[PDB]
Amino acid sequence: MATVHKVGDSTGWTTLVPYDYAKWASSNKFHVGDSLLFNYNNKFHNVLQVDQEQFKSCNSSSPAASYTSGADSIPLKRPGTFYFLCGIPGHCQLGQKVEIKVDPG
Amino acid sequence: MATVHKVGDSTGWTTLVPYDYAKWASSNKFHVGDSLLFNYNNKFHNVLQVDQEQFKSCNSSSPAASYTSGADSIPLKRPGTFYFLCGIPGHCQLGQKVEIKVD
Amino acid sequence: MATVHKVGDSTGWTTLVPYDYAKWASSNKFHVGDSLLFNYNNKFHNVLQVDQEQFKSCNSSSPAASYTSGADSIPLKRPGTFYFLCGIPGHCQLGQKVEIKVDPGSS
Amino acid sequence: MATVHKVGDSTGWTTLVPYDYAKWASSNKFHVGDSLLFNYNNKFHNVLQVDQEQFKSCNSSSPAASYTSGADSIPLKRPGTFYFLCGIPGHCQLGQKVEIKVD
Ligand SMILES: [Cu+]
Ligand SMILES: [Cu+]
Ligand SMILES: [Cu+]
Ligand SMILES: [Cu+]
């Protein structure tokens, strides 16, 4: 049985207050088959999949994938590092971004 | 021996033709541990889990979960009745919705 | 052989003047594997795939598929009748809609 | 006499990882009568045929043709050099473009 990981737990995907999404990620163990659930007010944020370089620079100008439901379920079908961030101007820079490590050795 | 239930069989999840999803669900036996597989053109459809009220009114404004892979594998780990519909404008009203009773 | 059918030929997809897209379709023979090419100014029109009911009523509120490139290539992979129309308010009603018959049994 | 060239092989048409499409094209021999197959998640990418100038500048403003099926089968019926790129903002600049020399 796979696992659905709620990003930020009860806090969800937000910029309201500082939230260490890196620590949230490290408190979780991601396996192939699992999924991510991003809960947020879709009138304020979105979820964009980017690469390492874009993630580090909070570059949201050319995302690989985009989600805007406010309750996005995202599949983790292959091992590796995935990166997600909110593309609204200034949000990623305030910490709204998360690195997901799926089945590392 | 879990079972994967392919929603709409080969027809999949669409509005191209009328398709009786209720009848499809009835031709299936859902048990805890099983899963649902929604195959569709993800550029034009989506899969949203909603509550009974939203399902009836075809309300896709506050989904419990939104799937957009085009090949969504959704687990059935709890007994009860669950509802899914496509949130694309008017699709649910065209019949793209399905009630799933587990156990 | 797979053929790309240019909707409206040199006239393209437009509402500028009346254009009988039904006669354009009739002048063509659609076979599985073929495709349609819709040429238009994407700042003015779009291409929406709908069902028979919507086609007849020019209802563009719930299309099955949508295209907005101005040079849309659309695949015809299975036999049957497909319907397309421009969803911009009033355009379909002025004639911007086309019925595509793919590999029908009879003429 | 007739070959289907799967763009990017199993990797397909994407920006998820750097992928050398130029090298892929070079590992292939295109002859009139062949075809190109672009496999991708059609919710996030597209395939546009453009001219040399637009290809170089990654200009997707006026494509000769736009494919969005996620499994586009594009015929190569004429010898010469043709250009394709994904028009999604910034994808072409990330390397999602391919030059095809036929015959
Ligand atoms: Cu945000
Ligand atoms: Cu839909
Ligand atoms: Cu129009
Ligand atoms: Cu792309």
Side-chain angles (χ1 to χ4, degrees):
Chain A
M1 65 301 276
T3 301
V4 175
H5 303 77
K6 297 200 310 179
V7 182
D9 308 311
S10 60
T11 305
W13 189 232
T14 184
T15 330
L16 221 302
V17 298
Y19 184 89
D20 200 322
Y21 286 102
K23 284 186 173 302
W24 173 79
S26 68
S27 75
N28 279 262
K29 187 174 181 181
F30 306 96
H31 295 127
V32 165
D34 285 357
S35 61
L36 302 172
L37 176 63
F38 288 79
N39 289 143
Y40 58 91
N41 180 336
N42 70 172
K43 293 304 173 188
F44 273 77
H45 319 284
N46 66 200
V47 180
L48 307 183
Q49 178 176 14
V50 304
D51 62 24
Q52 182 167 50
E53 171 173 40
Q54 298 170 328
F55 179 76
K56 297 184 179 177
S57 67
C58 271
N59 182 355
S60 58
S61 68
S62 315
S66 302
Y67 305 85
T68 64
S69 79
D72 313 305
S73 175
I74 301 178
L76 300 175
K77 37 207 165 190
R78 301 179 70 84
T81 304
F82 300 59
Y83 307 86
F84 302 89
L85 57 74
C86 173
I88 310 308
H91 297 208
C92 175
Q93 295 92 320
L94 282 169
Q96 197 173 14
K97 67 179 190 181
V98 64
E99 176 174 354
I100 306 293
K101 303 167 184 177
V102 186
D103 283 330
Chain B
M1 38 55 82
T3 291
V4 170
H5 302 280
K6 197 183 302 176
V7 180
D9 300 315
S10 64
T11 299
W13 192 233
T14 185
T15 59
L16 275 301
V17 298
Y19 183 83
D20 204 318
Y21 289 103
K23 194 178 304 296
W24 169 83
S26 300
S27 74
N28 276 273
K29 192 176 187 181
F30 308 97
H31 293 154
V32 178
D34 290 357
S35 71
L36 298 171
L37 177 63
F38 288 81
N39 289 147
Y40 56 92
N41 189 318
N42 71 151
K43 187 184 184 71
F44 310 125
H45 302 286
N46 64 213
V47 179
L48 311 181
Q49 189 202 336
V50 303
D51 60 34
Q52 188 182 304
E53 301 175 297
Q54 304 169 316
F55 179 77
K56 183 180 297 189
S57 62
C58 270
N59 169 38
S60 56
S61 292
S62 189
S66 168
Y67 307 86
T68 54
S69 80
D72 310 314
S73 176
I74 303 174
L76 302 179
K77 301 181 177 182
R78 303 174 67 64
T81 303
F82 307 87
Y83 314 80
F84 304 87
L85 58 76
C86 174
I88 300 303
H91 286 192
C92 176
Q93 295 86 312
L94 289 178
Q96 196 174 13
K97 54 158 61 173
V98 64
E99 177 176 351
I100 306 293
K101 303 165 182 298
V102 183
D103 275 48
Chain C
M1 76 307 273
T3 302
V4 176
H5 303 79
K6 181 179 291 63
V7 185
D9 307 309
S10 58
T11 308
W13 187 236
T14 184
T15 335
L16 209 302
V17 299
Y19 184 90
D20 200 325
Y21 286 104
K23 287 197 176 304
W24 173 79
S26 289
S27 69
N28 280 262
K29 290 184 183 178
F30 304 99
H31 295 131
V32 163
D34 289 355
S35 59
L36 302 171
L37 175 63
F38 289 80
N39 289 144
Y40 58 94
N41 179 342
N42 69 173
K43 289 303 177 187
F44 273 77
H45 318 286
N46 65 199
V47 182
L48 309 181
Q49 175 176 22
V50 303
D51 62 26
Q52 179 169 43
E53 289 179 56
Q54 299 170 327
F55 179 75
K56 297 183 181 176
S57 65
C58 271
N59 175 6
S60 56
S61 70
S62 188
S66 63
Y67 304 85
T68 66
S69 79
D72 310 311
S73 173
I74 301 177
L76 302 176
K77 40 202 167 188
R78 299 178 72 85
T81 300
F82 307 84
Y83 310 84
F84 301 89
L85 55 72
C86 173
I88 311 308
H91 297 204
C92 175
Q93 296 93 325
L94 282 170
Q96 202 172 6
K97 61 198 287 195
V98 65
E99 179 175 358
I100 309 293
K101 303 168 181 178
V102 187
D103 282 329
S106 66
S107 50
Chain D
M1 303 302 271
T3 295
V4 168
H5 303 76
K6 194 182 302 177
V7 182
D9 300 313
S10 65
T11 300
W13 192 232
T14 185
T15 58
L16 267 45
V17 297
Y19 183 83
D20 203 315
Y21 289 105
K23 282 184 182 177
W24 171 82
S26 299
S27 77
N28 280 265
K29 280 193 174 183
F30 307 102
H31 296 151
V32 179
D34 291 346
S35 70
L36 302 171
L37 176 64
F38 288 80
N39 289 145
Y40 55 93
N41 186 317
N42 73 151
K43 187 183 198 307
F44 311 122
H45 304 284
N46 63 213
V47 178
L48 308 181
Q49 171 183 28
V50 301
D51 61 35
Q52 180 178 53
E53 178 178 53
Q54 306 168 319
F55 178 76
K56 185 176 184 300
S57 62
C58 271
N59 174 19
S60 58
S61 286
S62 42
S66 168
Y67 307 85
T68 55
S69 81
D72 311 313
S73 178
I74 303 177
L76 302 175
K77 301 182 179 182
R78 302 184 181 71
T81 303
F82 310 89
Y83 314 85
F84 306 85
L85 58 75
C86 174
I88 299 302
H91 285 192
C92 176
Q93 297 87 311
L94 289 181
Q96 199 175 6
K97 52 155 65 174
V98 66
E99 174 177 344
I100 308 292
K101 311 170 191 61
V102 182
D103 182 59

